[PDB]
Amino acid sequence: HHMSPIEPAASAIFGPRLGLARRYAEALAGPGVERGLVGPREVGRLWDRHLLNCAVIGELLERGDRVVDIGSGAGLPGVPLAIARPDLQVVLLEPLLRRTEFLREMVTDLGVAVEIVRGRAEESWVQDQLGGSDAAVSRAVAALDKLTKWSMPLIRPNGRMLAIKGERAHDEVREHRRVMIASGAVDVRVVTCGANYLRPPATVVFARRGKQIA
Ligand SMILES: Nc1ncnc2c1ncn2[C@@H]1O[C@H](C[C@@H](N)CC[C@H](N)C(=O)O)[C@@H](O)[C@H]1O
């Protein structure tokens, strides 16, 4: 079978919306695979590697944050985040129409307060449409320099960038810190989330939108 939630982590993270989480995992395991959006090998990793690892980065988001998920793909990390944290207002930014079709289907079949923008982060109209967001999250999108260039315009002054990055976080920070600062980041550091539940924990390149103009 192997679609039943990993406990107690799943209830820790999703609480009363565990059922929404399970519905989402099922659709990723079903139509997500049938449509070529979820790799077959990932089906048995949907809880620990995808839903849980993505949703724990909510530990770094304040109540009621407006969040842009840059390059959401099949909904990761934005949809696990929205399910875990109903207080958030999540927007999934994704350019591929095949993927946005998928996302709209799921978001309506879940009742989750998630919106979908089909566009690329570097587009002027996107920067206007999603400017002033409280946070910009991402996973598996781009190297940290381009990612930060894409993220900072969408974040209000003193907002937060959360780039899920894994064991390559530190290297990436060390390589790109300088140009990250030039793009408007300050206080760049590697942080971990969900360390009560996951080993390794989720590893996130955290930054603030500093006051400097890029
Ligand atoms: N400039 C861009 N702006 C927004 N999304 C992009 C951009 N470039 C690539 N993408 C998307 O980023 C996603 C890359 C995927 N590898 C990641 C999907 C998802 N974030 C995941 O972790 O499973 C794709 O779905 C792309 O269509």
Side-chain angles (χ1 to χ4, degrees), residues 70-73 76 94-96 99 119-122 139-141 150:
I70 300 172
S72 188
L76 306 154
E94 172 56 49
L96 299 181
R99 280 152 199 232
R120 316 191 161 262
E122 65 279 19
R139 189 185 69 168
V141 172
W150 288 351

